[PDB]
């Protein structure tokens, strides 16, 4: 398996894991597990620390949205939606202003 973890500025530990079977391929006949002071040298693929690639592109797109209801709150049957300075689309099955994009409470 393979897990990663980190500590937040929240002083919280956030961790995730995936089951990934990691088996180094035995290079050469001698199934060795730690490379020696003395021995032969053979070619083998590997990575490098360079930070400038050559045409290996990954797209980035505008996030769709994040629908969270914490902004809402019931005021005697009157829902209050708070924006605190973002662009929020509200849409309700209720009549009247059922739909609308606003940036104000």
């Amino acid at each position: 398996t393979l897990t990663v973890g980190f500590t937040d500025s929240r002083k919280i530990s956030h961790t995730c894991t995936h089951p990934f079977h990691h088996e180094p391929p035995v290079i050469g006949r001698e199934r060795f597990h730690s490379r020696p002071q003395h021995g032969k040298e053979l070619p083998c693929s590997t990575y490098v620390q360079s930070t400038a690639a050559t045409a290996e592109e990954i797209e980035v797109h505008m996030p769709p949205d994040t629908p969270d209801r914490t902004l809402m709150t019931q005021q005697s049957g009157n829902v209050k939606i708070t924006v605190n300075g973002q662009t929020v689309r509200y849409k309700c099955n209720c009549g009247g202003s059922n739909e609308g994009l606003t940036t104000t409470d």
């Binding site: 393979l2 990663v4 956030h14 995730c16 693929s45 590997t46």
Partner: protein, 53 residues
């Protein structure tokens, strides 16, 4: 100085495992593992950025 990530952002995605059996949403979701290297070193893709403020 290899600065192309101005408008990038991290995730907060459903990680398969947040610990103790239940799966929840974390900022450290991973979805790609590369191990084709013969040496054994592995690339690990991760949701959140690193090396920036």
């Amino acid at each position: 100085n290899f600065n192309v990530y101005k408008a990038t952002r991290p995730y907060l995605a459903h990680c398969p495992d947040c610990g103790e059996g239940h799966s929840c949403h974390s900022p450290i979701a991973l979805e790609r593992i590369r191990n084709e290297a013969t040496d054994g070193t592995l690339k690990i893709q991760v949701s959140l950025q690193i090396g920036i403020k």
